[PDB]
Design an enzyme around this catalytic site. Structure first.
Site, PDB file in Angstrom:
ATOM      1  N   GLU A   8      83.356  39.483  38.052  1.00  0.00           N
ATOM      2  CA  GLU A   8      84.055  39.388  36.768  1.00  0.00           C
ATOM      3  C   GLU A   8      84.288  40.767  36.181  1.00  0.00           C
ATOM      4  OE1 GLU A   8      81.035  38.255  37.355  1.00  0.00           O
ATOM      5  OE2 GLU A   8      79.666  38.589  35.668  1.00  0.00           O
ATOM      6  N   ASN A  26      69.159  43.219  53.722  1.00  0.00           N
ATOM      7  CA  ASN A  26      69.970  42.860  54.860  1.00  0.00           C
ATOM      8  C   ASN A  26      69.005  43.073  55.996  1.00  0.00           C
ATOM      9  OD1 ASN A  26      72.171  42.460  56.544  1.00  0.00           O
ATOM     10  ND2 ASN A  26      73.218  44.372  56.006  1.00  0.00           N
ATOM     11  N   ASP A  34      69.292  51.311  59.285  1.00  0.00           N
ATOM     12  CA  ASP A  34      70.079  52.543  59.282  1.00  0.00           C
ATOM     13  C   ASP A  34      71.040  52.631  58.095  1.00  0.00           C
ATOM     14  OD1 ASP A  34      72.326  50.984  59.917  1.00  0.00           O
ATOM     15  OD2 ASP A  34      72.291  51.510  62.044  1.00  0.00           O
ATOM     16  N   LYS A  90      74.350  52.851  58.916  1.00  0.00           N
ATOM     17  CA  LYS A  90      75.618  52.555  59.594  1.00  0.00           C
ATOM     18  C   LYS A  90      76.050  51.081  59.531  1.00  0.00           C
ATOM     19  CE  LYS A  90      75.531  56.881  60.935  1.00  0.00           C
ATOM     20  NZ  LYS A  90      77.003  57.119  60.981  1.00  0.00           N
ATOM     21  N   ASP A 118      51.344  30.593  64.282  1.00  0.00           N
ATOM     22  CA  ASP A 118      50.542  31.677  63.703  1.00  0.00           C
ATOM     23  C   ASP A 118      51.234  33.017  63.421  1.00  0.00           C
ATOM     24  OD1 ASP A 118      48.476  29.855  63.550  1.00  0.00           O
ATOM     25  OD2 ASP A 118      47.501  30.575  65.374  1.00  0.00           O
ATOM     26  N   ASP A 128      72.441  35.903  60.742  1.00  0.00           N
ATOM     27  CA  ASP A 128      71.981  34.960  59.714  1.00  0.00           C
ATOM     28  C   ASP A 128      70.656  34.281  60.077  1.00  0.00           C
ATOM     29  OD1 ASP A 128      74.122  35.722  58.215  1.00  0.00           O
ATOM     30  OD2 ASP A 128      75.323  33.917  58.610  1.00  0.00           O
ATOM     31  N   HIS A 168      41.926  29.099  58.823  1.00  0.00           N
ATOM     32  CA  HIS A 168      43.304  28.816  58.428  1.00  0.00           C
ATOM     33  C   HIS A 168      43.350  27.579  57.532  1.00  0.00           C
ATOM     34  CE1 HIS A 168      44.958  30.867  62.375  1.00  0.00           C
ATOM     35  NE2 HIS A 168      44.305  31.705  61.586  1.00  0.00           N
ATOM     36  N   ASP A 190      45.663  25.570  57.321  1.00  0.00           N
ATOM     37  CA  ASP A 190      46.334  24.461  57.993  1.00  0.00           C
ATOM     38  C   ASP A 190      45.390  23.628  58.864  1.00  0.00           C
ATOM     39  OD1 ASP A 190      46.184  25.882  60.415  1.00  0.00           O
ATOM     40  OD2 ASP A 190      48.333  25.921  60.760  1.00  0.00           O
ATOM     41  N   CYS A 206      48.963  24.779  71.825  1.00  0.00           N
ATOM     42  CA  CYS A 206      50.368  24.583  71.495  1.00  0.00           C
ATOM     43  C   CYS A 206      50.599  24.902  70.045  1.00  0.00           C
ATOM     44  CB  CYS A 206      50.761  23.123  71.703  1.00  0.00           C
ATOM     45  SG  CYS A 206      50.411  22.536  73.322  1.00  0.00           S
TER      46      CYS A 206
HETATM   47 CA   LIG Z   1      73.495  41.681  58.313  1.00  0.00          CA
HETATM   48 CA   LIG Z   2      73.343  48.920  59.128  1.00  0.00          CA
HETATM   49 CA   LIG Z   3      80.932  36.270  38.489  1.00  0.00          CA
HETATM   50 CA   LIG Z   4      74.790  38.095  58.420  1.00  0.00          CA
END
Ligand SMILES: [Ca+2]
Ligand SMILES: [Ca+2]
Ligand SMILES: [Ca+2]
Ligand SMILES: [Ca+2]
Ligand SMILES: [Ca+2]
Ligand SMILES: [Ca+2]
Ligand SMILES: [Ca+2]
Ligand SMILES: [Ca+2]
Ligand SMILES: [Ca+2]
Ligand SMILES: [Ca+2]
Lengths: 638, 638
Positions: free
Chosen positions: B129, B152, B163, B165, B339, B366, B441, B443, B617
């Site tokens: 905005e 990120n 980095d 970059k 774990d 992601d 633990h 759990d 497991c």
């Molecule tokens: Ca990313």
């Molecule tokens: Ca980067």
């Molecule tokens: Ca906004």
């Molecule tokens: Ca991404």
């Protein structure tokens, strides 16, 4: 607080019950295999409810009532009074088979009820109330709650908090009271003890004493103390001291716990059965603006600066203040009382005292104590009167410190001191631009004065434009040959006159530039203090520029002045004489006097025969604290 | 925001005017000595008011009006639109002597008005905005404001933030947008530049890019960037990434500034004329409780554990989830998926992705990434469903971590991880007592399950008392010779039966003690989660004690289970067989099934022929994030 206590198959259970809790009791696990129903009896001071799938019914002391055994049918057990030697507090459960009404087994719970409460003055009236329900939290504001601790920076004879030892009972008066209140029979049952404790982290933030003999029981290298239990109604009085102020990485909050511990077996840790917690906030270090009532005027100067001492004494004699005179020391600057010392205070509901920040250049009772550049000096540290800015009130004012522009690569006060001031929180500091000055102190260009007969104040700003306007007027009036620095024999050969000043072209350009630096500050102060042009008076000032393009005073800076209410000690400027009066003095009077401010000019330079931009005297005024209590403020979330 | 601009005696002043500010203009300093009055003219797009001692009057473009010269009579100068090449924006002041109406001098102000705004999505709708008046602050809650940044932690091909970059344009989708909006004529006047910058402190918290070619202009070792000015209405699009999560000593808040700088001279720093600031908060790492919808089930096990894999696949086939199967690695424990990995998420208005906390024992797009004891494992890290406790709501639930008693000298999760979890703030962590367990633990003893067809949930607690009650019943029923561990050939020689368990006296005492440890936890959970006995189901469990007096499972702990909505994968207990069914299995079904929970027992131990207390497991379920937006929470003041 509900606590789990199970009947034991089929062995009797003995438990301590702490008032303010209740027990949920499993009767099903202790039932022998095959049992169908159960009945119960209980003593007079034990209340028992059968709770079947969430629905509870109170049960009589001796009933014959029976309930189906079931994991979802349990007891709720409460007691409202502590046990005495006359008590037999118990609940007995009988179990029955399908066939026959005679009990096939029995399980029982023998109880000893005790009151345990760790109490502090959380309501902030100075007395320790019984079990304040808010005592484990600390909230800001007029409706706020939770207890307050003073840093014990005092000394009676390093500071008092420097060690774990207590001598004078007077010391305990600086300390906050914490009382462990208990009630019960002659002794705790076998296998229990009461223990006070703190975290490793808080162990350098606090110390706790128990009283002719004061024992240090929690603090540095002592994280816990086993408390002796006394029966009946008992109170153990503790005294708590803060060891340090809030800072980067320390919010000011500390916690103290008491636990009832149950001995399980050898090599097994003891089980905390019950824990009570109180929280303290250590009171912040607070600065006093020029609007607050003066108490003492501290001054430093060489023994022979006679005019200065006479004129300061005369000023103070017009007031109710006391004058304290200090001379020079080998480890301290000529201004040290102004530059190396800042008078603040701390306050708790019970007590408060003034506290000095001491930063020696090289190197009592209810006066507490505690790469570098010139900007670290306390001439570079001021505080505004209370202000409101865009609806946000700052009831204690805001701290001001001189700095350079973010991208300049210039000087800045050390991070450690800035972090300290920011951590106090209640004065919400603002950085100004002082780095255009050779010395770099905000007190060179700005001050605050109260407006007599009102609740208002003025910002006073140094102004080179005001000086040039005045000098140009006097020149136009035929006074161009008026001489400055009259009576300073070391300036005489320079023959500095209004004409000579006004004709110096490079000096004019330098001062236009300095006026831009002043105006940049003017805008920040107006923004951050919520000031308008009506709140500001400009005092004529003039500077010379050094090799770094930084300013030093051409004549003494009048803005750095002793403010005692309506009475102002103003550095004598030694300006051009017109009709045998200093035109700078007359101009300043014309600005201030109409507002009811009384001006006294104080000569600190005559003893030196010349003025090169440095002043060799210093003053600092110690003031009464704000009436507004710091804990009533609601600072922004940090 | 009022800004100071003085007319210069008698030289013309040229200044940039930034929209959203106004100028207060001293006309008095520029007046020649002796001048009496002044008049003014101004251009069409400049508004001028004469302000005499606080009272302002608008003045016409060409008037003949005159005012008395005076320090307290000034101009106020405003502009509502940016300059174009067609602009001549100016104010001209004329000065007059006492005698005569012809100007004796003139001073003027030439203005170039520009719009400068650094804009972010502070209203949290995902679009940027124009100049949100709240953009320089960050407030919590539904009415809260200010922009959000993602760490990120991604990778497309260390993590993406490692980095300075940028390669894939896909990366920019994880990034928050920041736009510098300007409006003005073809160029800035001589002596000005626009500069974006950050503090040294924030330089490891952020990075900023400008776009086929993405340039990293602020971040590690880049504190400022000079921006190219384009005339007309222009927008420069920047992308901002977080480099790290909130932590001890980092609140999560970062700031970015833009300043208009004025060039003064060589060696003089540039003067910031105008500064605009936006603040970001880096989104916290958030954990997902068992009540949230499952997406993927991750499992690890040896390649030949066939029953486990068949039975897990069968369970997942009853749901809409995907199964991801992973085998053992040299640098990771047999349970590593449970774990060493914890699936959380991060969310911003524009984007969110799941983020894994990875803590290898030894050692994508992601899906983001990132002395020690067993308590540092993520088997020791859980989170409750949303709860309300004494009126205080925790809409994201509360994180639970196992610890020891404060005075015990026992194990505790490392301070670094605890500090991290606490700093995320929105899950308000609670420490439980896990240190009575050999592995340690949470759990091992507790879990949460949703109650099908409702918005409610249950706490499931391991219970030794439940196991003893059941076994004693089966013994009474004539089943004392019922054998456990049927089909595990490595247990056969032990011939463990209900009788043999019940007659082991030391084992009974050990388990009474473990039940005290469970009940201590039960009370903390009830207190800190606001739970009653109606919210809890007890699952039979049994432990053996080691030399440290810590517990390990006697038979597999059923409480650590795969929760996929109504469907539960429960570790197969291998309990005593009565009528060819496991009495532990039948008892668990009788508790859960009536609530609409569907139980599938999963055998992870048969492949090993025996059970010594260790499971080989692991499983972890990745879930959909909460619908509730974290920024709508109002966490307690820290
Ligand atoms: Ca990313
Ligand atoms: Ca980067
Ligand atoms: Ca906004
Ligand atoms: Ca991404
Ligand atoms: Ca009180
Ligand atoms: Ca003391
Ligand atoms: Ca001491
Ligand atoms: Ca004292
Ligand atoms: Ca000072
Ligand atoms: Ca976990």
């Amino acid at each position: 607080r509900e606590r789990t206590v199970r009947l034991q198959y089929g062995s009797r259970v003995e438990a301590v019950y702490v008032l303010g809790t209740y027990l949920w009791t499993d009767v099903y696990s202790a039932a022998p295999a095959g049992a169908q129903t159960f009945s119960l009896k209980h003593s007079e001071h034990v209340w028992v409810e059968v709770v079947r799938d969430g629905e509870a019914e109170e049960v009589a002391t001796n009933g014959k009532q029976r309930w189906l055994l079931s994991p979802s049918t349990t007891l709720r057990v409460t007691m409202s009074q502590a046990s005495t030697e006359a008590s037999s507090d118990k609940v007995t459960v009988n179990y029955y088979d399908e066939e026959g009404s005679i009990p096939i087994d029995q399980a029982g719970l023998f109880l000893t009820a005790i009151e345990i409460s760790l109490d502090v003055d959380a309501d902030r009236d100075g007395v320790v109330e019984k079990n304040n329900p808010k005592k484990a939290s600390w909230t800001w504001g007029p409706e706020g709650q939770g207890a307050i601790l003073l840093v014990n920076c005092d000394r009676e004879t390093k500071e008092d908090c420097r060690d774990e030892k207590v001598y004078s009972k007077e010391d305990l008066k600086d300390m906050s009271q914490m009382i462990l209140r208990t009630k019960g029979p002659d002794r705790l049952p076998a296998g229990y003890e009461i223990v006070l404790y703190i975290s490793m982290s808080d162990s350098d933030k606090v110390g706790v004493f128990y009283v002719q003999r004061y024992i240090h029981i929690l603090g540095r290298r002592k994280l816990y103390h086993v408390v002796k239990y006394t029966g009946g109604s008992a109170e153990l009085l503790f005294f708590v001291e803060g060891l340090c102020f809030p800072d980067e990485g320390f919010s000011g909050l500390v916690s103290i716990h008491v636990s009832l511990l149950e001995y399980m077996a050898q090599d097994i840790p003891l089980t905390p059965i019950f824990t009570d917690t109180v929280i303290f906030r250590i009171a912040p270090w607070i600065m006093t603006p020029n609007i607050l009532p003066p108490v003492s005027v501290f001054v430093c100067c060489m023994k022979d600066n006679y005019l200065f001492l006479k004129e300061v004494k005369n000023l103070v004699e017009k007031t109710n203040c006391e004058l304290k005179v200090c001379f020079q020391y080998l480890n301290r600057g000529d201004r040290w009382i102004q530059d190396e010392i800042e008078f603040g205070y701390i306050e708790a509901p019970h007590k408060g005292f003034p506290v000095v920040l001491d930063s020696p250049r090289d190197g009592g009772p209810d006066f507490g104590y505690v790469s570098v550049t010139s900007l670290d000096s306390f001439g570079n540290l001021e505080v505004s009167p209370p202000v409101t800015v865009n609806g946000k009130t700052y009831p204690l004012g805001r701290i001001l410190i001189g700095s350079s522009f973010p991208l300049s690569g210039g000087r800045r006060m050390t991070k450690v001191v800035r972090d300290f001031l920011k951590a106090q929180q209640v004065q919400a500091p603002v950085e100004l631009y002082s780095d255009w000055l050779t010395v770099g102190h905000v007190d060179e260009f700005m001050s605050f004065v109260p407006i007599p007969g009102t609740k208002k104040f003025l910002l006073l700003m140094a102004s080179t434009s005001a000086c040039y306007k005045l000098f140009r007027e006097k020149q136009k009036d035929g006074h161009g040959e008026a001489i400055m620095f009259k009576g300073l024999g070391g300036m005489s050969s320079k023959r500095i006159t209004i004409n000579k000043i006004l004709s110096n072209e490079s000096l004019v350009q330098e001062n236009l530039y300095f006026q831009r630096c002043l105006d940049w500050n003017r805008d920040i102060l107006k923004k951050e203090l919520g000031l308008t042009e009506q709140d500001i008076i400009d005092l004529p000032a003039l500077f010379k520029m050094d090799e770094d393009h930084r300013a030093r005073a051409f004549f003494p800076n009048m803005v750095n002045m002793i403010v005692l209410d309506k009475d102002l000690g103003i550095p004598k400027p030694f300006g051009p004489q017109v009709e045998e009066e200093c035109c700078l003095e007359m101009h300043v009077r014309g600005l201030l006097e109409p507002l009811g401010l009384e001006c006294t000019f104080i000569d600190d330079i005559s003893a030196y025969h010349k003025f090169l931009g440095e002043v060799h005297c210093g003053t600092n005024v110690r003031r009464k604290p704000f009436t507004f209590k710091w804990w009533h403020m609601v600072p922004s979330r940090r």
